[PDB]
Amino acid sequence: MADKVLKEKRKLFIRSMGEGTINGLLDELLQTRVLNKEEMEKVKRENATVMDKTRALIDSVIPKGAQACQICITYICEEDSYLAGTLGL
Amino acid sequence: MADKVLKEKRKLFIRSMGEGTINGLLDELLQTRVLNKEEMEKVKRENATVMDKTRALIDSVIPKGAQACQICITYICEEDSYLAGTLGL
Amino acid sequence: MADKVLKEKRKLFIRSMGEGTINGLLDELLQTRVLNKEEMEKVKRENATVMDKTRALIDSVIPKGAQACQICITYICEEDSYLAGTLGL
Amino acid sequence: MADKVLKEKRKLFIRSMGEGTINGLLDELLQTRVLNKEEMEKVKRENATVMDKTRALIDSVIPKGAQACQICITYICEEDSYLAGTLGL
Amino acid sequence: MADKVLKEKRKLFIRSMGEGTINGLLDELLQTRVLNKEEMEKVKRENATVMDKTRALIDSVIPKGAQACQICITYICEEDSYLAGTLGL
Amino acid sequence: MADKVLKEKRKLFIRSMGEGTINGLLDELLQTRVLNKEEMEKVKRENATVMDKTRALIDSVIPKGAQACQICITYICEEDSYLAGTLGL
Amino acid sequence: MADKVLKEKRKLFIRSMGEGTINGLLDELLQTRVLNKEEMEKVKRENATVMDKTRALIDSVIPKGAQACQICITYICEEDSYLAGTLGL
Amino acid sequence: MADKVLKEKRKLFIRSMGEGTINGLLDELLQTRVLNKEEMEKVKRENATVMDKTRALIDSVIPKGAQACQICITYICEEDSYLAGTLGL
């Protein structure tokens, strides 16, 4: 499932992802109702660097299960194909 | 019945619960008068990690009976449907 | 009285109120001497999201009595009429 | 005298006192030499919630006599007029 | 001596000093080796408001003796002459 | 072995370690399954200063054995070569 | 001799010691093997105020002879020269 | 060595260095692998004033040793000769 894949690639995700991808993924997750306004604002406002934002986003998304990680994987593949190829997914 | 269901899923609740869901559930339980101000303050301020907060909340809610557990389950299902699905609710 | 009204609508205030309203209400409460400088600074500086700020402000204002909550209600009605209508004030 | 008044209002004090007022009252009591450094440190660091801090402060101040209670009452009246009014002082 | 003066003006110091003066005084105390790196980091990172920072700094400086308080008084006089005149030193 | 080396360099580690290095080392230890989520969250959330974080991390890593200290030493050497040379690794 | 000096300066040590100095002295004593891990954890976690920590540390160090007290005196003189001068060391 | 020099001139560095020098020195330190991407971004993004940036940079560079401070000193001498002459190095 997608949760194991996302757990296996955590360091690469932290070291590779940028701010525009963070914003787009947050918008997609809010649209799909995986996250609510409070969680999104906690991710955005409580962290200053993009590494901390990625860390918080991954730690928020993984416990939700495989159906929540599949949305992230599909969005990244469809919108960040170069980053998706670098990440091996 | 709701209390037995909440007892059977304690470990999953501890391992899967997030901070935003904790805050929303605390607000809802305060609104329904299941918990008072002092209990919510003890939950929030005496614990540093989200696992400790979830542990304290479950240990404070289960003894209250089945009607408080039903309120908790209903709120989680209506507001955190992905977590509710991964928990088996 | 106003304290019961403000206690009955706590969740709506938490989910509905924005940062500009927080700043204006804090200025009004400081001018009316309901709060002092230390309380305002703890509301502003110890919280990162606006939900936490609203939570702290309500928890600080409710115990002061009905005369302190009436000031908040009047300010919201005269300055945020759309939000006041949504909240039912 | 002030000690009897503070004794008959213990529950209201516990349920209504805030953190900023506690900090200011501790500063005033330290300045007036009613309490020493160790007592204030035990009040601050051995309690996590504001209710516990208020409980400890009242239990430490009442045995000292009427003058120590009068200092607290005067400070609260001069600096927290809304709380003083809702407390019946 | 300087320690008695700093003990007699604790409330005024807490209520009057700002963040820039705190930063300058911390730099001066680190340069004079009155405080070490750990104490300065503990003052800065464990307090959110400037009142808490001033409280921690005064409580850390007073026990060191009169020679440590003289450095603080001299720095404040030479760098914050308006605040020094307000404080009466 | 690596555990003895980590025991006899504890003070240097506490006095020299930085926050970014701790974040990277925590990510590496989570990836290698030396630590789980609860221990990492206790290290990150229960300590406010970098010295306390380093102290907690070292006290959590040493009892695990030589094979975890080896992972820590290897990561530090490959990622913080200047700090590794200063420490004597 | 060091043990007698530390025994006749106990009140000054209790009233003048700070938390950063306590942490540094604990690290030094653990490095020199004067104390083991259990004693350090018992000093740190069973006391809430710095006065209690100082009392526990002094009562743990004095019965171990003159070398253990000399180590503490040397560390304090080398790292806390202002406090050492205040204490007459 | 250079680390002692940077410890001695910390206040002058904080009060004398501008933003262009910060940017150039950060680029040089990233090129020489004294700092990594996370530390550089943490210095840049979590501080608003140039004094805070200089403070963070010095506190991050000093613990790395003398070979990391010599790089900074050499870069400042080669690129900011007027500032280097003012700093006396």
Curated annotation (Swiss-Prot), chains A, B, C, D, E, F, G, H:
Induction entry: Transcription and translation induced by M.tuberculosis and a number of different M.tuberculosis components; EsxA is the most potent activator tested (at protein level).
GO biological process: AIM2 inflammasome complex assembly; apoptotic process; cellular response to lipopolysaccharide; cellular response to mechanical stimulus; cellular response to type II interferon; cytokine precursor processing; defense response to bacterium; defense response to virus
A GO cellular component entry from the record: protein-containing complex
Domain of life from the UniProt record: Eukaryota
GO MF annotations in UniProt: CARD domain binding; cysteine-type endopeptidase activator activity involved in apoptotic process; cysteine-type endopeptidase activity; cytokine binding; endopeptidase activity; identical protein binding; kinase binding
The keyword Cell membrane appears for this protein: yes
Keywords: Apoptosis, Cell membrane, Cytoplasm, Hydrolase, Isopeptide bond, Membrane, Phosphoprotein, Protease, Thiol protease, Ubl conjugation, Zymogen
Domain CARD: 1-89
Tissue: Expressed in larger amounts in spleen and lung. Detected in liver, heart, small intestine, colon, thymus, prostate, skeletal muscle, peripheral blood leukocytes, kidney and testis. No expression in the brain.
Propeptide position ranges: 1-89
Broad class of where this protein is predominantly found: cytoplasm
Similarity-based family: Belongs to the peptidase C14A family.
Function per UniProt: Thiol protease involved in a variety of inflammatory processes by proteolytically cleaving other proteins, such as the precursors of the inflammatory cytokines interleukin-1 beta (IL1B) and interleukin 18 (IL18) as well as the pyroptosis inducer Gasdermin-D (GSDMD), into active mature peptides.
Subunit architecture: Heterotetramer that consists of two anti-parallel arranged heterodimers, each one formed by a 20 kDa (Caspase-1 subunit p20) and a 10 kDa (Caspase-1 subunit p10) subunit. May be a component of the inflammasome, a protein complex which also includes PYCARD, CARD8 and NLRP2 and whose function would be the activation of pro-inflammatory caspases. Component of the AIM2 PANoptosome complex, a multiprotein complex that drives inflammatory cell death (PANoptosis).
The protein's name: Caspase-1
Species annotation: Homo sapiens (Human)
Gene: CASP1
